[PDB]
């Protein structure tokens, strides 16, 4: 569980926001791309795995599970690529409520940013710093440091 | 200590690689941009501070120190924007040797990537996972978790 991440793809302003959620903490990283492709998802996972110790990624749909480019990046970065089937039903709900919350925050900051990608990084920042009591940024550091020791 | 980062800008292939180094651990994050501007540097800092608890950034030159857009992003994200004058002379040398090592790694992987930005993320991954005995990725999590407790 310190190493398990889930991918999530949501839409806004005609663009795609791709999110990686560290399952145990709720910490997220996200980017804006014009559309979800295997190549974009692969590059995003390579960025993620250089920054956090990514053991397993539950992919967000069967196209990214099947993509040879995603499987290449997961091979390169030492990630086990898995499906993202909600075996625990409560998963669909937690991801959905997260997307709704992120879009809410995006709308609250959107006029402070020229580009959507700036508003999405402001939402990532607010999500990861929010306490409710430790924040997700605290929880993920505590979980990994405990693993290391 | 835990919250101090230094910016660093190096060139390859006619493009610019902008790097943030967490000074206490040597952990890095990087991106490729066509040229260093205040707008790009500001967006990069907003990404970094949503991901790690950035208290202080030593900027890499006087243009990004002066830039109103960089000061706006540091205000938004709660960062103290500082100069990057090497009061400790050993600093120039540490940065320069890091740039040289990153370029060496980029050249070692460059034929595995279509785009430079992929090669730079592979170099980030190799730099942060290298042990010499803890890696920089381990050290930054240890340092931050110790600070939280």
């Amino acid at each position: 569980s310190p190493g398990i991440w889930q991918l999530d793809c949501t839409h806004l302003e005609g663009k795609v926001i791709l999110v990686a959620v560290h399952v145990a903490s709720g910490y997220i990283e996200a980017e804006v791309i014009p559309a979800e492709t295997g190549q974009e998802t692969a590059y995003f996972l390579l960025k993620l795995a250089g920054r956090w110790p990514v053991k397993t990624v539950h992919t967000d749909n069967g196209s990214n599970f099947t993509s040879t480019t995603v499987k290449a990046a997961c091979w390169w970065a030492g990630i086990k690529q898995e499906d993202g089937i909600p075996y625990n039903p409560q998963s669909q709900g937690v991801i959905e409520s997260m997307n709704k919350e992120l879009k809410k925050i995006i709308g609250q900051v959107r006029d402070q940013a020229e580009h959507l990608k700036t508003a999405v990084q402001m939402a990532v920042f607010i999500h990861n710093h929010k306490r409710k009591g430790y924040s997700a940024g605290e929880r993920i550091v505590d979980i990994i440091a405990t693993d290391i020791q | 200590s835990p919250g101090i980062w230094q910016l660093d800008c190096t060139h390859l292939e006619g493009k610019v690689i902008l790097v943030a180094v967490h000074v206490a651990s040597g952990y890095i994050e990087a991106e490729v941009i066509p040229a260093e501007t205040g707008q790009e540097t500001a967006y990069f800092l907003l990404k970094l501070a949503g991901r790690w608890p950035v208290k202080t950034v030593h900027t890499d030159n006087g243009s990004n120190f002066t830039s109103t857009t960089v000061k706006a992003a540091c205000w938004w994200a709660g960062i103290k924007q500082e100069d990057g004058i090497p009061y400790n002379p050993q600093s120039q040398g540490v940065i320069e040797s890091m740039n040289k090592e990153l370029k060496k790694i980029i050249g070692q992987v460059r034929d595995q990537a279509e785009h430079l930005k992929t090669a730079v993320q592979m170099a980030v991954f190799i730099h942060n996972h290298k042990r010499k005995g803890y890696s920089a990725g381990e050290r930054i999590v240890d340092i931050i978790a110790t600070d939280i407790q």
Partner: peptide, 8 residues
């Protein structure tokens, strides 16, 4: 193109 970021 047999690259990690573009396997075509």
């Amino acid at each position: 193109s047999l690259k990690i970021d573009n396997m075509d």
